[PDB]
Design a protein around this ligand. Structure first.
Ligand code: HEM
Length: 153
């Protein structure tokens, strides 16, 4: 359970993201695909992209980055009271998209790295630890839903 002070750190940096949701979503997905190429393979939509320049030039990738970060922002702003938002995401990522929990750890790492690059003055160690906790909570709660459905592994 995050404290109120931890949530403030999380949402203070997240407010900086929402000034350029699409740029962040590109940096995060590109980092994810470059660092963990098995993740790109999960997107039939993106698996034709073979270079970082091709990734940066894809408008469809940029659109999807906004979809992802809009859904994560709505979850973070619930401060843990996010059951309604996770149900559907867990269900589609477990049963339709077939995304292992481990790849949610990978995209969490990408999110933290991009927030540190773009917002260092609002993403010192205290905020980095709080955002790590918030993403852990996200993963823990998605993982319990995966387990229910037979996908925790
Ligand atoms: C912060 C973590 C994530 C969030 C908030 C998120 C959110 C979403 C949302 C809102 C959608 C569209 C609605 C739906 O299908 O449920 C979607 C689609 C999808 N996601 Fe995620 N996602 C996350 C992580 C991942 C990861 C790590 C992968 C793959 C490694 C992935 C793979 C997919 C795929 C394959 C689709 C369908 C894309 C398409 O072909 O249109 N997601 N995601």
């Amino acid at each position: 359970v995050l404290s109120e002070g931890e949530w403030q750190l999380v949402l203070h940096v997240w407010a900086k993201v929402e000034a350029d949701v699409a740029g962040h979503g590109q940096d995060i997905l590109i980092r994810l695909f470059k660092s963990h190429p098995e993740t790109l393979e999960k997107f039939d939509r993106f698996k034709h992209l073979k270079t970082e320049a091709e990734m940066k030039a894809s408008e469809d990738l940029k659109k999807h980055g906004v979809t992802v970060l809009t859904a994560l922002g709505a979850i973070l702003k619930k401060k843990g009271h996010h059951e309604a938002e996770l149900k559907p995401l867990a269900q589609s990522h477990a049963t339709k998209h077939k995304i292992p929990i481990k790849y949610l750890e990978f995209i969490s790492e990408a999110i933290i790295h991009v927030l540190h690059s773009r917002h260092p003055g609002d993403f010192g160690a205290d905020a980095q630890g709080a955002m790590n906790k918030a993403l852990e909570l996200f993963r823990k709660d998605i993982a319990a839903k995966y387990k229910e459905l037979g996908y925790q592994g």
